[PDB]
Design a binder for this molecule. Structure first.
Ligand code: ANP
Ligand code: ANP
Ligand code: ANP
Ligand code: K
Ligand code: K
Ligand code: K
Ligand code: MG
Ligand code: MG
Ligand code: MG
Lengths: 333, 333, 333
């Protein structure tokens, strides 16, 4: 007999997802928010704010409420929470609700406590904080309860997260701030250096998605980009090829492969054998980079699987974990 | 339930247009006014005053009430507003009316406030001031609400106005006092230098319209002009060709192309890509100069469209914006 | 509802014309008056006095009441006004009448005021003074209201009047005292120098009318003149040819063409173009000089029309202007 609503949230640096027990996933939009600096009014958020990135008047302020699991703008976080459930024809579901949040391993206890405080402020009565790595593992269809080791690589917009999981525990974890946003910056840096053209972030992210890859793929294809020539200052277009972008990504993943090496270096020997057999599981947005699994196999010789629907791994995991959370509540935890 | 009349106005330096909700465009005449200097009586305005330019006794004073969106003659502005609706068989529609005015980006807050004060003086209760660039964009059939960048070039009689528009906002704007009047002066300067003939403004404007162009066109044709020989002081005629006038306009547009370059130089890179794809939109009277679109394409390589009915873009935009203004009034703005 | 009579007057230096509303032109005779110097009695006026010019006893005094629009003899003017309407079987129509007078541009405000005073003295209640040039333009069938420029050349007995007219206004005006009387004097001067014969004015005026011309015409014809030989003092006749007289007129019109040149030199350039297209209109008595239009065309290359019935242009114009004057009276002007 549970009368209270169950809410889970994936408050990622790039995409925010919200789940309501009984309704399903009720929100899944970019995390960007647009404020007016002269008046501090919330102009837009989600897709509406994402379409404006780089095309906005100088009075508009683009905000990311959460950066790497840390509330970066208190008021923006509060505004986003007051909106995710605004398209649900119901009174506030935050009231005395059970809230399950997922945090990267890098988040601090104080920052975790600040997360709970914002949820309680909305009206929740119980606020549980789970490890993102095990939520993602669950979402990818891994039975984390088993005494079997798995290597999870969660590539998001702000951070790349590495976790050795086994018996539902994170035995080893590493995190680095080289992810989707870092890849975009480097794509932008390269195009500037090579073609003397200044492109926006939105354009950098679109070539990443449209031709980005780590190993040659079955539909190699070029792309036309449009930016501002650094010399003339006028609009200028250029043709970008798959090879060039593959080399940019290979350069940026050099630091991620180094984190994997360090992670394995601190992994208990008996868990190392499981890694040889169970391999790597890649999830998050970065799991969509073409042939990222072939890349990891070539370098490490470990089996590498891309989680199906890798953008939803975390939120999908919170849905699986709902049963566990309601069994614990029934046990007084 | 709106009982108050809706009035919008395009108070251009050359042509004044007035719109009444329910009646349509109710006034569209030149902005010139004719006063008697010995008595200060309003002799004529609109077409009647325009036909007299350069043919009037020395006691007559030609007045332009608004020059570049700035009330230049307070009393003349007041007289014009008391006349636009004089051919409407109705009592004053200014009473407690909703008035929508459009201003060039160069107008100052104080001058904008002076505009509202004149409208309130007539009897209006609500006086809204919109950007001319977005009214013109609307008039040209652009969905300014979309997160897509457009370059608007508004060539009038007093000013050329450049605006980068996107998401219903003016992200970048530049304005220059090189427009129809400047072109006429230069046509007059050229004919004096080349043929030693002093022509009036009316004659300068008519050759601009009758053979003026920026690129060779499908009906190249000469024109006979009539002026006063600077040496003999007697009447003298001359034959003016398309080529000569094209070269005069090409010289004057050199400064407009420089403003476009500066505008693009201060345009965010991601908006520059949209400009490459959406191109330029030319409106205003100057949009009628022959092959002005071919001119802009040749120089910048950007798609260039001439707004259909480019003299009515602004007023047509105020009509489209009426719905938005009445939704805001319903929301207490 | 107008109960008051309407009177208009053309008080020319040579011919006086009077118009009564409802009756038409009621008087049209030479302006000469004959007084007895020993008794100051009015002997004759009009045609009767004109037939006596040069044939009168030494006690008779020939008077011109108005010379160039200026009352030259106060009593003679008063006598003429008491006679123009003497052949109308009605009581004084001057009583509380509306009087429209026409003045050359050279007349002074004081002289204009003296004109009104004489009319009021007769019994008029309203005395309007119009420009002769626009009355003549009207009489010649020009729509002076239009914003189109016309060059009017009014050649009378005392003055030649030049006016640029447009929008019912005299934009530029010049006047010279070289007209019919000056031509007669020069005809008399020539015949004296060439044939040693002293002719009277009447004879000078008759050869001007009978063979006078400015360009060779289709019925070149000689004339027999009769005067007093300067040597013998006895009567002597001589044969005068068309050529000789044409050369005399060409010499006298040299000063009129100079006035036209000066007029055009002070004409606004945009009005100069209209002059090229609308041309010159010649009216007054001097418009009857043969081929005066061919003369003006040859010298200036401007279209030149002779007003039909050029002696009646002014009075005919006052008749057209009657409607305007009665609309103004209805408006309290
Ligand atoms: N097809 C694709 N190819 C490459 N990158 C992609 C693709 N689709 C999305 N991305 C990137 O994946 C990221 C979004 O993944 P996501 O898992 O939602 O990150 P996040 O959880 O919101 N941020 P984080 O807090 O670091 O986990 C963005 O940087 C996207 O640019
Ligand atoms: N066919 C044409 N070819 C060239 N110029 C033209 C043509 N028709 C009109 N114009 C000019 O266009 C101008 C009028 O355009 P318009 O948009 O009405 O300006 P405006 O709004 O009244 N003045 P502004 O306040 O500067 O915008 C005048 O300078 C005209 O001479
Ligand atoms: N056929 C003709 N050829 C030449 N001159 C003529 C002819 N008929 C009349 N005239 C002259 O024309 C003059 C009369 O014209 P008119 O328009 O009546 O002058 P006016 O108005 O009376 N004088 P003014 O006050 O100067 O305008 C006289 O000088 C006549 O000699
Ligand atoms: K996410
Ligand atoms: K206008
Ligand atoms: K006369
Ligand atoms: Mg994530
Ligand atoms: Mg305009
Ligand atoms: Mg006269």
């Amino acid at each position: 007999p549970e009368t209270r609503p169950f809410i889970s949230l994936d408050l990622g640096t790039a995409n925010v997802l919200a789940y309501v027990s009984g309704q399903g996933v009720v929100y899944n939009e970019p995390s960007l928010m647009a404020y007016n600096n002269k008046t501090n009014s919330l102009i837009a958020l989600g897709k509406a704010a994402y379409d404006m990135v780089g095309k906005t008047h100088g009075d508009i302020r683009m905000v990311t409420p959460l950066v790497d699991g840390v509330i970066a703008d208190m008021e923006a976080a509060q505004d986003l929470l007051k909106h995710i459930f605004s398209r649900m024809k119901m009174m506030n579901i935050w009231k005395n609700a059970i809230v399950l949040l997922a945090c990267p391993s890098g988040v601090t206890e104080l920052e975790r406590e600040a997360l709970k405080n914002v949820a309680k402020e909305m009206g929740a009565e119980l606020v549980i904080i789970e490890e993102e790595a095990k939520m993602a593992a669950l979402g990818a269809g891994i039975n984390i309860e088993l005494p079997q080791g798995h290597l999870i690589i969660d590539i998001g917009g702000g951070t790349t997260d590495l976790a050795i999981i086994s018996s539902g525990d994170i035995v080893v974890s590493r995190s680095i701030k080289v992810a989707g946003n870092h890849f975009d910056d480097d794509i932008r840096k390269y195009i500037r250096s090579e073609y003397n053209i200044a492109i926006g972030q939105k354009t950098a992210e679109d070539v990443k998605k449209f031709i980005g890859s780590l190993v040659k793929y079955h539909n190699e294809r070029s792309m036309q980009i449009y930016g501002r020539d650094i010399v003339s200052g006028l609009p200028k277009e250029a043709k970008i090829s798959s090879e060039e972008i593959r080399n940019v990504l290979l350069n940026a993943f050099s630091k991620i492969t180094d984190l994997v090496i360090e992670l394995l270096e601190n992994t208990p020997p008996e868990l190392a054998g499981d890694i040889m057999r169970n391999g790597i599981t890649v999830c998050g947005g970065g799991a969509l980079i073409r042939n990222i699994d072939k890349y990891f196999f070539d370098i490490f010789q470990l089996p590498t699987k891309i989680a199906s629907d890798s953008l939803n791994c975390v939120i999908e995991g919170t849905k699986i974990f709902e049963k566990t959370i309601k069994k614990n509540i029934e046990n007084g935890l």
